[PDB]
């Protein structure tokens, strides 16, 4: 239930294969420990593009505080944030600077979509838009809405958080094995649905 | 500048200072997500959701009416019939990474079969699974709206329902009555 | 006479002056319920029209549109001269407080219409932005290139022939060779743009991703050490194609694609497509929806005030107030969420009304904000607007008189710190805003930094009276008007009835079928003044749909003002205008 | 010969009638039982216009356009007022027992009736009592019927008898009660009953293939074939 990319220059330039678990408990107890550092301070990429990221500010704010999360420092450059949120449209002229700032980025580096503007291409279907983020770069967290409420694009970042404790990244470039593995973990659709089909009565809409 | 400019300007650093320090001893405004849980209106635009009938049947005959009210034509169905008559979708698709969540199909359903409950979480990890069929959208309950039925109201007779049966239709009058 | 009713406005002191200066026959006026005179005029004559109005008693010193529109698959086009292309002008005249509409004939193969200029500096990116969508060119222009879309382009998408979606296209391919010759395309080299390079002036270029909320955009520019000579602006990175989208969905199914045209309005975005709808329609709203439209509209105006006033506070210097006016938006937010169901895009207006009725208790809640507002307001004033720092920062930066406004087509508080009393819902009163009382601020007739933001923090306050005005008296009635055309019908009836059930089924599917006219109806945004221009050729589609968003205005003043700066005097006057690249390109 | 519509001179075929000759002009004028390969009957009273008697006649008087001439110098009304109001009457008069079945019905997006409730303006409903109902008919594996939507237009019968000589359907039952259909149940034994699937404005004759799996007219990519 994992999957081996590796990197090596149609984008993107890497492959993923099904590969089972590996994963000596001192090795697997510092992987847990590098992820859990990992996924505890995660540094997003400031990048102003449309609607959604007024809305990721949103969730910046002291009202909503994705500052308990250690996911606050928003840096300005690509090289020094670990996290892009494509939180927009992937326009035409504006795709090569998004592939660009994605290159800009080390490993390790992660991909979260905010809107349906950058999950599919969205309500615009025009010649200017491109359908969707995952066109040229990978994605890791996915988030729908138009806008995402800010509480939903905390639970992506949860939905990221365990994503990254329980994958597997090499310790030391000089020793072991350099591929990227990523757990195939079960989607919240069919993990949710044993309560969302439950569901039975809703407040009625001439309400407050 | 001047010295009445510096002192000035000097009080008013002093000023935001102290302002800020009591803005410090105030209380804070933040909702903790995710142990305080949102509350959310009851008109409020989430989660995609199909309601069900009074009686336990599923509310959509079908009609197709939210897939082409859908401006961005993110739901796709099929008409299909029982053997007493009665429409339901064969499937039921929603593309959840296409839709806006702007409501159009909860206005234009005609059944009150689809709706937008107040739930917002919906983030995924792979795009192939934000395609919610028909088995992601049938709730156990009427949702928003609870007593409302179609096909109390429908012309088409149905199972349970014969010719007449239904809100403001008289019985069927025969051509061959013998009353003028 | 409803407001609604076709005229031709032949009683217009303006078409008399044209009749004596040009003669009788030298143009033919059209009937449409624009609401303004339209007056279709020889290509030849434009520049003499031109020169005409600008030198009038009352002068049409602003131009506050032009573009063009494609007639050939035009059905009904009685009574209007033959054309396969036509170029609009609205020209607007303050002082006569009217406006024209100047419409002239393009065949199919001689596309070039004389450059417009030499009277007002904003035909510059106007014409790029007629020559970019249309094909059309003007001659005499300094650069004719394209504005929204790279030169690396095919075609010119507002015509009626080109495949508006991109799934008609092939999927987005970026191979290796095709990103390389687009990053080749987006190096700026100074000749073809006109920057016309001493052997000392340092290039710099910012952007196109931008760390701010007011979208993704490019500056260019020419450093003599730390002063600006020469700038020009690059846009064109948030293009959504919203003109052609609109010749691609229905009359209802438009509003959410005029909810993102500036994300910053929301209702007040939606607000003047659906009232060129009803126009279209002849449709005349009960009072209880226009004074539901007008509190969402003053609630959203409230919240892209406070926004615009946090975003500049942060640009400044001082981190706070962003999240305190950012709580302040998420009681707004509440409030929005209460009522309409979503927080930034509500989508909530209708065609007649409003989507639902209000819910038993908005009033608790508009009360709390209304009694949670003006201490912080007061508070932001003197924690950060009374700041010397923000003051030294700010004033006299990026300052500009009437004429410089008036020319370059600027609206908003960017005119009216100009001394110049000229706002929408005062001149011309829509949807009921004459029933509240509220005060039009106006600046000393220096636009500083400093002017704008303190004309926003009034225009907040004003905002305030009239959420106070609204909530105090509030009309009980219908939600939706009883006209057929109202899309949707009320949702019980449609429940319980058949008729109702019919309209609601041919109005939802296939569209609501307008009759063959022409509507324009300009509101005053959050960011200025916004207009939208309907033309219909009696099918259930827009057959043309512009929109007219004042930071396109804005960003073409941007080098007139900037000129012989820093750059922070940039990054200030950048965060100190309340754009977005979504109004700028939409 | 010349017709004034609106005050509007127009040039027509004098042997036609009004309806078709402004039908041909583009102008739009509500019609249900007249066809253009059957005649007119003068049936459902739905094409009603104001007729003068000369150029200088403010009063007029209602005809239908499916039975009055074009002849030469014809002056008539289409959005007149009293005209409009008495469309929308008889389109209210055939929504008194229309049954709410249009999201279940096969004709629902290619009804007539609804784009004819749609063009006259009729929106709001004051009928408050009950609704008459019929009993359906086997027509075979072909048609479906559905007798509860009918409006008593008489296409059916007229296009069955005049024009395709079937001898199996027709019109039966008396002043509400009238009911158009097989006197029995039985398939159709006509080779034309296909037509009758858009002779009727309505649903009560659907394609019962089509039905099996059934999609609207907006969901369907067309092409033209032989
Ligand atoms: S998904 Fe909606 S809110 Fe997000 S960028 Fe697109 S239009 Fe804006
Ligand atoms: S909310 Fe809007 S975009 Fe989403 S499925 Fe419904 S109609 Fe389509
Ligand atoms: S509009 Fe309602 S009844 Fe019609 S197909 Fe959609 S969910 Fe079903
Ligand atoms: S069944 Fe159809 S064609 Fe026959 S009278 Fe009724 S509506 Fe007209
Ligand atoms: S035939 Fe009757 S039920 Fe069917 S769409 Fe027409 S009016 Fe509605
Ligand atoms: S169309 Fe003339 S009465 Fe029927």
């Not at chain 3, 910012?206 to 602006?233: K, M, T, W, Y």
């Not at chain 3, 690059?234 to 009359?251: L, N, P, T, V």
């Not at chain 4, 253009?36 to 006649?57: H, M, T």
């Not at chain 4, 229309?98 to 004709?107: A, G, L, R």
């Amino acid at each position: 239930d994992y999957t081996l990319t590796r990197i090596d220059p149609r984008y993107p330039l890497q492959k993923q294969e099904i590969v089972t678990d590996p994963l000596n408990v001192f090795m697997g107890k510092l992987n847990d420990m590098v992820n859990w550092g990992r996924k505890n301070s995660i540094w997003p990429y400031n990048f102003g593009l449309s609607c959604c990221y007024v809305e990721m500010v949103t969730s910046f704010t002291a009202v909503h505080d994705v500052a308990r999360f250690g996911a606050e420092v928003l840096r300005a450059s690509p090289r020094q944030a670990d996290l892009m949120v494509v939180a927009g449209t992937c326009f035409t002229k504006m795709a090569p600077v998004i592939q660009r700032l994605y290159d800009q980025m080390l490993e390790p580096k992660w991909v979260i979509s905010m809107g349906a503007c950058a999950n599919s291409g969205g309500m615009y279907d025009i010649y200017s838009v491109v359908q969707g983020v995952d066109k040229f770069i990978p994605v890791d967290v996915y988030i729908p809405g138009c806008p995402p409420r800010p509480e939903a694009y905390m639970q992506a970042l949860m939905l990221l958080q365990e994503s990254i404790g329980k994958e597997r990244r090499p310790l030391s470039w000089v020793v072991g094995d350099q591929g990227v593995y990523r757990a195939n973990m079960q989607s919240e659709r069919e993990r949710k649905r044993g309560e969302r089909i439950a569901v039975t009565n809703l407040r009625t809409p001439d309400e407050i | 500048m001047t010295l009445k400019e510096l002192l000035v300007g000097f009080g008013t650093q002093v000023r935001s200072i102290w302002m800020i320090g009591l803005h410090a001893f105030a209380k804070r405004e933040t909702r903790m997500y995710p142990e305080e849980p949102v509350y959310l209106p009851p008109r409020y635009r989430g989660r995609i959701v199909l309601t069900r009938d009074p009686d336990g049947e599923e509310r959509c005959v079908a009609c197709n009416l939210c897939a082409v009210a859908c401006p961005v034509g993110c739901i796709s169905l099929q008409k299909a019939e029982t053997k007493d008559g009665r429409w339901y979708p064969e499937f039921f698709r929603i593309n959840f990474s296409r839709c806006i969540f702007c409501g159009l199909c909860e206005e234009a359903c005609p059944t009150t079969a689809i709706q937008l409950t107040p739930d917002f979480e919906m983030g995924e990890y792979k795009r192939q699974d934000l395609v919610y069929e028909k088995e992601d959208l049938l709730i156990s309950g009427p949702g928003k709206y609870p007593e409302y039925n179609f096909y109390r109201m429908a012309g088409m007779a149905i199972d349970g329902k014969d010719k007449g049966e239904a809100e403001n239709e008289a019985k069927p009058i025969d051509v061959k009555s013998l009353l003028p | 006479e409803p407001a609604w009713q076709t005229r031709d406005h032949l009683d217009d002191p303006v078409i008399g002056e044209l009749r004596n200066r040009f003669g009788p026959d030298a143009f033919t006026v059209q009937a449409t319920r624009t609401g303004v005179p339209v007056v279709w005029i020889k290509r030849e004559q434009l520049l003499e029209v031109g020169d005409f109005l600008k030198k009038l008693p009352k002068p049409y010193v602003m131009l506050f549109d032009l573009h063009g529109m494609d007639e050939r698959l035009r059905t009904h086009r009685e009574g209007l001269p033959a054309a396969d292309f036509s170029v609009f002008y609205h020209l607007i005249s303050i002082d006569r407080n009217r406006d024209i509409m100047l419409k002239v004939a393009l065949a199919e193969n001689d596309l070039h219409v004389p450059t417009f200029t030499k009277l007002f500096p904003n035909a510059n990116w106007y014409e790029r932005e007629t020559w970019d969508l249309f094909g059309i060119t003007f001659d005499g222009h300094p650069n004719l290139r394209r504005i929204m879309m790279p030169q690396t382009w095919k075609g010119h998408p507002l015509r009626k022939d080109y495949p508006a979606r991109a799934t008609e296209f092939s999927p987005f391919e970026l191979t290796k060779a095709k990103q390389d010759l687009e990053m080749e395309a987006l190096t700026f080299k100074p000749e073809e743009w006109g920057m016309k390079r001493n052997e000392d002036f340092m290039f710099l270029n910012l952007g196109p991703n931008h760390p701010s909320a007011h979208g993704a955009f490019r500056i260019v520019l020419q450093l003599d050490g730390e002063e600006i000579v020469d700038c020009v602006p690059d846009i064109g990175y948030h293009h959504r194609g919203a003109e052609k989208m609109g010749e691609r969905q229905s009359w209802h199914s438009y509003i959410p694609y005029t909810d993102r045209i500036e994300y910053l309005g929301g209702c007040v975005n939606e607000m003047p497509y659906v009232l060129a709808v009803e126009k279209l329609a002849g449709i005349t709203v009960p009072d209880r929806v226009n004074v539901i439209r007008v509190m969402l509209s003053e609630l959203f105006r409230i919240n892209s005030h406070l926004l615009y006033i946090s975003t500049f506070i942060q640009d400044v210097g001082a981190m706070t107030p962003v999240f305190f006016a950012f709580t302040d938006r998420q009681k707004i937010y509440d409030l929005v969420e209460a009522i309409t169901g979503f927080r930034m895009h509500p989508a909530w207006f209708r065609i007649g009304g409003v989507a639902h009725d209000l819910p038993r208790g908005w009033d608790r809640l508009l009360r709390e904000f209304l009694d949670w507002m003006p201490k912080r307001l007061a508070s932001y004033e003197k924690a950060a607007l009374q700041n010397t720092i923000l003051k030294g920062r700010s004033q006299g930066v990026a300052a500009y008189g009437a004429k410089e406004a008036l020319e370059w087509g600027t609206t908003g508080a960017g005119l009216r710190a100009t001394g110049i009393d000229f706002d929408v819902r005062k001149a011309r009163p829509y949807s009921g805003y004459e029933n509240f009382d509220f005060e039009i601020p106006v600046g000393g007739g220096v636009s500083d930094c400093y002017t704008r933001v303190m004309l926003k923090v009034e225009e907040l306050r004003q905002s305030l009276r009239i959420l106070e005005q609204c909530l105090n008296n509030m009309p009980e009635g219908p939600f939706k008007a009883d006209h057929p055309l109202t899309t949707p019908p009320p949702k019980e009836r449609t429940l319980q009835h058949i008729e109702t059930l019919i309209t609601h089924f041919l109005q939802v599917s296939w569209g609501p079928v307008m009759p063959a006219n022409e509507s324009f109806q300009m509101i005053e945004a959050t960011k200025g003044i916004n207009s939208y221009y309907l033309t219909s050729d009696g099918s259930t589609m827009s057959y043309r749909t512009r929109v007219r968003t004042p930071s396109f205005a804005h960003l073409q003043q941007i080098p007139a003002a900037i000129r012989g700066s820093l750059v922070s005097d940039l990054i200030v006057y950048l965060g100190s205008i309340d754009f977005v690249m979504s109004d700028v390109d939409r | 010969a010349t017709i004034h519509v609106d005050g509007k001179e127009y040039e027509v075929n004098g042997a036609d009638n009004l309806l078709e000759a402004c039908l041909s002009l583009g102008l739009d004028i509500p019609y249900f039982c007249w066809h253009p390969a059957l005649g007119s009957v003068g049936a459902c009273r739905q094409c009603a216009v104001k007729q003068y008697q000369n150029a200088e006649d403010t009063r007029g008087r209602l005809v239908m356009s499916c039975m009055t001439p074009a002849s030469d110098g014809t002056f008539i009304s289409i959005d007149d007022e009293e005209a409009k109001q008495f469309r929308e009457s008889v389109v209210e008069w055939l929504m008194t027992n229309h049954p709410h079945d249009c999201p279940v019905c096969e004709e629902g997006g290619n009804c007539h009736l609804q784009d004819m409730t749609v063009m006259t303006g009729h929106s709001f409903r004051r009928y408050r009592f009950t609704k008459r109902t019929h009993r359906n008919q086997d027509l075979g594996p072909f048609i479906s019927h559905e007798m509860n939507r009918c409006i008593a237009c008489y296409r059916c019968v007229r296009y069955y008898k005049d024009y395709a000589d079937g001898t199996d359907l027709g019109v039966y039952g008396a002043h509400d009660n009238v009911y158009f259909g097989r006197p029995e149940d039985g398939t159709l034994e006509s080779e034309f009953s296909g037509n009758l699937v858009e002779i009727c404005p309505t649903g009560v004759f659907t394609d019962k293939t089509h039905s099996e799996r059934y999609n609207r007219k907006w969901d369907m990519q067309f092409a033209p074939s032989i």
